[model samples]
Target: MRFRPFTEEDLDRLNRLAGKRPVSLGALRFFARTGHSFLAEEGEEPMGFALAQAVWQGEATTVLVTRMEGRSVEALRGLLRAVVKSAYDAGVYEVALHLDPERKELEEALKAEGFALGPLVLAVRVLGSR
Candidate 1:
């Protein structure tokens, strides 16, 4: 497997991988313009991807990972390390990632890689209460 910077040719695969998320073609375009994205491929086929947006706040960066599948933890770790290293090289001081509360494994992985949990938010909406 290999990790590389994203290209226009990778869009279709990325779109499918993004699935029903808020990611759109326009958003992808914007991300390409304003952030950095990387993909993991095996023999010319994409298997995973990670994206990060640079910010000026103390947070410095926000990242997301999708479609993470590989032969072993080493493969996933390679992709994540590349993404974070690239972000740091671009002047980001810290990176933040959001994951579903149910993904305990993911959270543990992040912690193992030196990321700490930050504040959490809970939102509620009531229909027809206006």
Candidate 2:
């Protein structure tokens, strides 16, 4: 597998893979607006992707692993490492990603790469009337 920056040409495949999720359109739009995205491919086929945004708050950057999947663990690691390096080189002192608690294997992999669990809980609420 190969890791690379995203290009316009990869959108179709990305959309398809992401479309498998219900909120793909919103997610894609958010990633596009953020301007930080990475893609993973094998030969000519896309394997996975990750999207993040830079937060100027008292943090280097707050990244969301918008998406990630691949044919193997190595592919996932390659994609993740590429994005992490890109964010770090772009003046980010640190990066954070959210993972479901059930993703033990993924968490282990990330921890092995020096990522640690933050001491904060993220909360959100919908404001509009239902």
By TM-score, the best candidate is 2
Candidate 1 per-residue lDDT over residues 23-79, each given as its tens digit: 566656665554456667778766666666666655454444433433344445666
Residues 1-130, model 2: lDDT tens digits = 8877765556776765464663355566676566567777788887777777777666445655656655555666776787678676776766677777676655666776777776776677979987
Q: Flag clash pairs in model 2.
A: none
C-alpha-based local distance difference test score of model 1: 0.61
Please give the distance, in angstroms, between residue 70's alpha carbon in candidate 1 and its true position after superposition: 8.0
Candidate 2 positional error at 17, Å: 3.0
Runs in model 1 deviating more than 4 A are 58-76, 119-130
- What ranges in model 2 sit over 4 Å off? 22-35, 58-60, 128-130
